[PDB]
Amino acid sequence: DISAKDLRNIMYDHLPGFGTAFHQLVQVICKLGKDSNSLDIIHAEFQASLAEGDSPQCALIQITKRVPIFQDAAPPVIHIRSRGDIPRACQKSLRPVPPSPKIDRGWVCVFQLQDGKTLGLKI
Amino acid sequence: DISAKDLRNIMYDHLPGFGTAFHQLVQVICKLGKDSNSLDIIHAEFQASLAEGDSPQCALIQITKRVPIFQDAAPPVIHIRSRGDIPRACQKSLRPVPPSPKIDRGWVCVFQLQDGKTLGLKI
Amino acid sequence: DISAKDLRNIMYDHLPGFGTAFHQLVQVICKLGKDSNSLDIIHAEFQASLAEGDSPQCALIQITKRVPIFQDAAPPVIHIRSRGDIPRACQKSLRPVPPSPKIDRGWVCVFQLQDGKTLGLKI
Amino acid sequence: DISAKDLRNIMYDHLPGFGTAFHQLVQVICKLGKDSNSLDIIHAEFQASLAEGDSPQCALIQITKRVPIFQDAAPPVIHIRSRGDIPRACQKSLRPVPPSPKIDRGWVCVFQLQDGKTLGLKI
RNA sequence: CGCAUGCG
RNA sequence: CGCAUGCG
Ligand SMILES: [Cl-]
Ligand SMILES: [Cl-]
Ligand SMILES: [Cl-]
Ligand SMILES: [Cl-]
Ligand SMILES: [Mg+2]
Ligand code: NA
Ligand code: NA
Ligand code: NA
Ligand code: NA
Ligand code: NA
Ligand code: NA
Ligand code: NA
Ligand code: NA
């Protein structure tokens, strides 16, 4: 068994840079994983992908496609006070949110400002 | 149900320029699509990607990543007489081939000259 | 011996466009070069890079990599009133600041608004 | 102590992709290193850089600026049959050689084709 | 500004 | 085509 915090840190230590869309995806993956008791399945898939020589980024995409909790799942809403609260290497990946975004199509999360404005983070 | 020619024309209508590396990708997509009877699935993915705000170029890339026939597929080899047979706008995207290229990693096709020399087309 | 104004004019005469990130880099280079009495050394590096085939943009970058005053240097903070004060052609190169930015890693300057919000200019 | 083969492989293992300008720089560094008996210092410098959190690419550039054999050193000439013999991710880094290329200014090597054409590899 | 790698 | 990272 692995905790959410421990798994996030393992995943973060494989990712280039900081505050990228993949860093946000790690947080999303680990929260949904925790809530669905999928953390060990997720961890196993991550390790196996690395073992096969896949990039960490590739491994995270594959998790959203292969682990059941993410299949046909909507991105979580993340409430923020301002655009400045969005991770610092994600700003160019924001788009208006479509009617039915799916995590397995690259919609990581939906940021929601205090006036209710939303911005979708897309890989 | 959609013709390969018709789907090609739809795709081309969305693309900037003429004879670009993405026009070459359209042709590869339509050939492999026709052969696998996947043209309707391909047309659906193209439209779904455009609908969620993807550029036409990105929508084509999404097809290679999401439609089963392109999964792990090696690029076709296209035999040519000279480098002049390659559309001029594709020339900036030409590069030597790797050991085991995959369409879903950006390798559209491999051009091969009479003397066996090759030039890969990478988006 | 060369003045900061003369060097800036030489550099500008090489650059395309108006109000680009590279124009701001010139201003940063000439200021820190004036302060450190490095203008002749900067000038020599600029000319030496051009002579070996670097673009003017690349030659300005080579100065930040090669001239001692720019080594690990933190970028200057420029106080502004609105994001509209930042030249239009620079807008594409703006992003949030990292923990400890350095000129020789591409951080030209940091624009700061009255309320303390910041925008880093990254080449 | 370390051998030239063991050092190359250590360095290669840290580099992204294959056949890049940095892969060629590894071969150059270990060749001139071996010939000048600088392998242990080169290894020491590479490890310290990585320990500081520098990228392997950064570490290799620092070697060319810090290790005496590379200071003001001419790039080696590599005799090849045709452009196809150049490493597969170096083609876009080739340019005409200036009068006096230096490794510490990023001139990794000069390829000499059988037809007489010279092409310098520039980082 | 450009190259390389990763990802879509 | 775009984004991210690294390098010049
Ligand atoms: Cl906003
Ligand atoms: Cl449709
Ligand atoms: Cl403003
Ligand atoms: Cl290693
Ligand atoms: Mg983050
Ligand atoms: Na990181
Ligand atoms: Na067109
Ligand atoms: Na091959
Ligand atoms: Na590698
Ligand atoms: Na280059
Ligand atoms: Na990278
Ligand atoms: Na790329
Ligand atoms: Na970059």
Side-chain angles (χ1 to χ4, degrees):
Chain A
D1 194 293
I2 190 170
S3 74
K5 176 181 152 75
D6 282 3
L7 183 55
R8 274 194 311 268
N9 283 344
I10 291 168
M11 295 180 156
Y12 290 147
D13 274 15
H14 289 275
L15 288 177
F18 299 98
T20 77
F22 281 99
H23 290 85
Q24 188 66 70
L25 180 56
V26 166
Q27 184 284 330
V28 166
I29 277 169
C30 296
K31 189 184 205 315
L32 280 170
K34 185 192 156 193
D35 292 332
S36 65
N37 283 112
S38 301
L39 288 178
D40 288 327
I41 298 295
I42 289 161
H43 184 225
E45 294 288 324
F46 188 72
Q47 288 309 317
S49 286
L50 294 189
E52 291 302 310
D54 292 346
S55 67
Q57 300 98 314
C58 179
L60 296 163
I61 298 301
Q62 287 310 304
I63 283 157
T64 65
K65 295 181 181 206
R66 293 204 242 250
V67 182
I69 189 67
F70 304 112
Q71 303 186 336
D72 225 27
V77 167
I78 299 169
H79 289 78
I80 52 169
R81 289 194 83 79
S82 83
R83 220 202 183 89
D85 292 335
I86 294 169
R88 72 172 178 86
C90 281
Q91 307 284 343
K92 290 183 171 174
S93 289
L94 302 165
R95 322 185 158 181
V97 181
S100 295
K102 303 291 182 211
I103 291 167
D104 64 4
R105 293 179 68 82
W107 294 98
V108 174
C109 61
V110 175
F111 292 108
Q112 185 169 308
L113 294 156
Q114 295 181 285
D115 74 343
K117 207 107 148 191
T118 54
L119 290 169
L121 179 58
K122 179 78 159 73
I123 302 186
Chain B
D1 218 325
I2 188 143
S3 179
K5 200 182 196 174
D6 284 347
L7 181 63
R8 182 208 68 163
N9 290 348
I10 288 173
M11 285 168 170
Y12 279 9
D13 199 44
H14 287 79
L15 289 176
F18 302 92
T20 77
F22 288 92
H23 289 80
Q24 194 74 23
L25 182 53
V26 171
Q27 294 174 60
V28 170
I29 283 169
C30 288
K31 193 270 192 289
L32 272 47
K34 183 194 168 193
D35 286 352
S36 57
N37 303 131
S38 307
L39 291 166
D40 291 323
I41 294 297
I42 293 164
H43 189 207
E45 180 47 50
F46 183 69
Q47 300 302 351
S49 284
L50 296 181
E52 64 192 336
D54 284 348
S55 72
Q57 295 97 325
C58 182
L60 298 173
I61 295 157
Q62 303 296 23
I63 288 159
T64 67
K65 283 165 194 286
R66 294 173 177 155
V67 182
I69 194 63
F70 302 109
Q71 156 136 109
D72 292 308
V77 180
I78 308 180
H79 298 260
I80 56 164
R81 285 284 209 283
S82 68
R83 192 169 172 147
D85 296 328
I86 300 167
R88 73 188 181 273
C90 281
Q91 274 158 20
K92 58 183 170 277
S93 301
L94 293 178
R95 61 178 287 170
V97 302
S100 192
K102 293 177 223 316
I103 298 171
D104 66 18
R105 300 200 72 206
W107 296 95
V108 174
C109 65
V110 177
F111 295 108
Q112 188 156 8
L113 297 164
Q114 287 164 290
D115 66 357
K117 288 179 192 298
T118 56
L119 301 156
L121 184 61
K122 176 68 156 56
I123 66 95
Chain C
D1 206 312
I2 199 174
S3 74
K5 185 181 194 297
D6 281 359
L7 188 58
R8 178 202 67 211
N9 291 349
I10 291 169
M11 286 170 170
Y12 275 31
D13 198 25
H14 276 100
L15 294 171
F18 166 66
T20 75
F22 292 97
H23 291 85
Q24 183 62 247
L25 181 53
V26 168
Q27 296 171 57
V28 173
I29 287 171
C30 290
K31 186 78 203 73
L32 283 163
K34 181 166 198 290
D35 281 344
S36 57
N37 291 336
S38 309
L39 291 175
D40 286 345
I41 277 151
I42 290 164
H43 194 193
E45 182 54 45
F46 187 63
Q47 295 298 321
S49 289
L50 288 178
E52 58 193 354
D54 295 340
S55 67
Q57 296 95 331
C58 181
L60 293 177
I61 293 169
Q62 303 289 23
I63 290 164
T64 69
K65 311 267 174 192
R66 292 178 180 152
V67 175
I69 188 67
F70 304 106
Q71 163 98 316
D72 298 315
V77 175
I78 306 171
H79 299 268
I80 57 165
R81 282 283 229 108
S82 51
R83 193 178 166 150
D85 294 335
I86 301 160
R88 279 281 227 198
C90 281
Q91 300 278 341
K92 61 192 175 283
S93 299
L94 300 171
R95 54 178 297 171
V97 303
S100 182
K102 292 164 179 73
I103 293 164
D104 64 11
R105 293 199 85 213
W107 295 94
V108 180
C109 61
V110 183
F111 296 100
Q112 186 155 12
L113 290 157
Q114 285 167 289
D115 70 354
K117 291 182 177 59
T118 53
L119 293 166
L121 181 70
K122 175 72 163 68
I123 283 179
Chain D
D1 181 279
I2 199 159
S3 72
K5 186 169 81 70
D6 285 343
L7 190 55
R8 273 197 311 278
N9 287 339
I10 284 166
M11 286 179 164
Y12 285 150
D13 270 354
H14 280 103
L15 289 175
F18 302 95
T20 71
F22 282 101
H23 289 82
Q24 183 72 65
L25 181 54
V26 170
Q27 188 278 330
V28 168
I29 278 169
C30 297
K31 169 69 178 150
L32 300 196
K34 180 173 183 150
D35 286 343
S36 63
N37 287 77
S38 301
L39 292 176
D40 287 345
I41 178 59
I42 289 163
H43 182 226
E45 305 267 359
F46 186 72
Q47 289 310 320
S49 284
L50 297 184
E52 285 307 311
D54 300 332
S55 64
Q57 297 95 322
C58 184
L60 296 168
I61 298 294
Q62 286 314 295
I63 286 163
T64 68
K65 304 196 183 196
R66 291 180 190 163
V67 184
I69 192 61
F70 307 107
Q71 292 169 351
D72 262 284
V77 176
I78 296 171
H79 287 83
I80 62 171
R81 188 156 298 255
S82 70
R83 270 187 80 123
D85 297 348
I86 292 161
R88 70 171 182 86
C90 289
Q91 297 286 340
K92 295 189 175 176
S93 289
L94 302 175
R95 45 168 94 163
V97 185
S100 186
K102 301 289 170 198
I103 294 167
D104 56 4
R105 291 186 62 86
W107 295 97
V108 178
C109 67
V110 173
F111 297 102
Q112 170 86 333
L113 313 193
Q114 286 199 346
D115 60 27
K117 183 75 198 151
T118 58
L119 293 157
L121 173 61
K122 177 67 161 74
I123 293 174

